[PDB]
Amino acid sequence: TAEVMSHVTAHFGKTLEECREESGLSVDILDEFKHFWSDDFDVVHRELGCAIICMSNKFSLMDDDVRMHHVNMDEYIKSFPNGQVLAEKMVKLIHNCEKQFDTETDDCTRVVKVAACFKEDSRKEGIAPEVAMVEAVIEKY
Ligand SMILES: CCCCC/C=C\C=C\CCCCCCCO
Ligand SMILES: [Mg+2]
Ligand SMILES: [Mg+2]
Ligand SMILES: [Mg+2]
């Protein structure tokens, strides 16, 4: 659900600032991670793929093939209030998007394509949160 997705986003997003230098993700590309969910943000830059890699690796959320670690992602989602209702669905969506971009050889570009797929399928499945919702949860943990 959208509230669980806003807790995952708010928490995950905390690692954005420490990942900027190494990914090249200028503040003019993405200022706050929460804006990932805006209608006016295009999830397209290779730099943001590189940043998502950096962020993920902080929480062990990707495996050594630079794809989602399913078990660690399940446990991470379940660590939020009401996480059990999202954990299976979100792992399924990400992994279906992963399958669509398996032929992309550049890991950064691949990850940003997967992320744009995941945003669109989240919107489609009615689990994409509003930016206001992520902001409402930003001070937690
Ligand atoms: C992965 C943490 C989830 C945070 C939710 C909001 C936005 C981020 C979506 C990241 C897309 C999934 C990246 C890993 C799949 C690429 O192989
Ligand atoms: Mg770099
Ligand atoms: Mg709107
Ligand atoms: Mg690792």
Swiss-Prot record:
InterPro entries: Odorant/phero-bd_Lep, PBP/GOBP, PBP_GOBP_sf. Gene3D superfamilies: Pheromone/general odorant binding protein domain. Belongs to the PBP/GOBP family. Present in the aqueous fluid surrounding olfactory sensory dendrites and are thought to aid in the capture and transport of hydrophobic odorants into and through this fluid. SUPFAM superfamilies: Insect pheromone/odorant-binding proteins. One of its GO terms (biological process) is sensory perception of smell. Disulfide bonds join C19-C54, C50-C108, C97-C117. This is General odorant-binding protein 2.
